């Protein structure tokens, strides 16, 4: 009934963090936790498709998007399933994650279990950019850290 | 206390050449590492932070790399402007600690505006050296003047 998941972010760079996921019944997914070693500001935070860590964060592949939609923010209708928008780092280089989302899930067709969370170099523009790239990646830039999403106790 | 250690302690290099300072921490600092540059006697300046990210207004010839305990700053094509002391700082653990610095100088090579800029560059250096002498002699006056007010 109540599903829990967890994700340990790792990269070559300074970013570290643990992400927690809880989802009771078919309620929303509560994402929570802490990311360190970020620059102050906003950082794109997305579920990528594959939990493949063989080639760092590059092997995670593109945003988790089974509905073949375009990139957007978390509140948009036109968005990828994985698009959870931005986490915000303070002057301490730390981001407290607190996100509630309904499109992602810990079971069924929209399960993120066995896929990768990625925190990005720059802000996610939520698909409101002045180029092709914006409706793909949101110009969030390179992938600072990632982790496969596992089932938690 | 983390001991961050730089090498070389000083270094000489020709223009256009490719230079590489290193910084080695006594433990993993997970890329919480900043590079500061301090030209002649002016204020320190931020080149690089989080090991590899250039700061604002930093020439792109500067680059930073490394992880774990071992990091390096690399100037790809050395201009004459770049003669300076370079410092690494780690902020992974408190207290923040700093390398002892790498001093970097030229060894040599081989326009009225250019001759007169070189001439004025002596002025701050000279005025600085004079002010050292003034404060030196002000500290010698200081006791005597205190005795006079007694």
């Amino acid at each position, epitope marked *: 009934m109540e599903m829990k998941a967890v994700c340990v972010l790792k990269g070559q760079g300074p970013v570290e963090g643990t992400i927690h996921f809880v989802q009771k019944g078919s309620g929303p997914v509560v994402v929570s936790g802490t990311i360190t070693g970020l620059t102050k500001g906003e950082h794109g935070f997305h579920v990528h498709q594959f939990g493949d860590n063989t080639q760092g964060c590059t092997s995670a592949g593109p945003h988790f998007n089974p509905l073949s939609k375009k990139h957007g923010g978390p509140k948009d209708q036109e968005r990828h399933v994985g698009d959870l928008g931005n986490v915000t780092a303070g002057k301490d280089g730390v981001a407290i994650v607190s996100i509630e989302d309904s499109l992602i899930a810990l079971s069924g067709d929209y399960s993120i279990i066995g896929r990768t969370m990625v925190v990005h170099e720059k802000r996610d523009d939520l698909g409101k950019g002045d180029n092709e790239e914006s409706t793909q990646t949101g110009n969030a830039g390179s992938r600072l850290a990632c982790g496969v999403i596992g089932i938690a106790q | 206390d983390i001991k961050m250690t730089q090498s070389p302690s000083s270094m000489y290099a020709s223009l256009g050449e490719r230079v590489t300072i290193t910084c080695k921490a006594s433990q993993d600092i997970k890329s919480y590492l*900043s590079w500061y540059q301090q030209k002649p006697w002016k204020s*320190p300046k931020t080149l690089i932070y989080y090991a590899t990210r250039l700061a604002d207004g930093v020439p792109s010839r500067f680059s930073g790399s490394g992880s774990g305990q071992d990091y390096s700053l690399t100037i790809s094509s050395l201009e004459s402007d770049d003669t300076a002391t370079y410092y690494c700082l780690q*902020h992974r653990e408190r*207290p923040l600690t*700093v390398g002892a610095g790498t001093k970097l100088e030229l060894k040599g090579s081989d326009t009225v505006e250019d001759i007169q800029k070189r001439l004025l560059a002596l002025d701050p250096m000279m005025e600085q050296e004079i002010e050292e002498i003034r404060q030196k002699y002000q*500290c010698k006056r200081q006791p005597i003047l205190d005795a006079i007010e007694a």
Partner: nanobody
Amino acid sequence: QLQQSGAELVRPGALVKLSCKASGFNIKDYYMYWVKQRPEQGLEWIGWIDPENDNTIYDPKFQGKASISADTSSNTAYLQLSSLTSEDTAVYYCGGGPLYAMDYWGQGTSVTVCS
């Protein structure tokens, strides 16, 4: 811009209080650092203050000799050195930045201590 106080010259045992007036940014959004550089020598980091809550970290080497404070209203940071000796003859830089870079190492205040 970070405007630091002017050159000091004091007797052994004197207190001195340096200042750092920031214009262009709210110091509440940063940390204000202090850095010492004894002549012909390298940088020592003294400490920083988070003006948002007046929390201060120091290098133990300085905790007790040096005292860092901020006035959020006048948007100014302060460094206070007490029981000054020749050891303390140095240039003190104030800077501001996140925890991961003093993005404003600037100006600098020379302090000279007699004997």
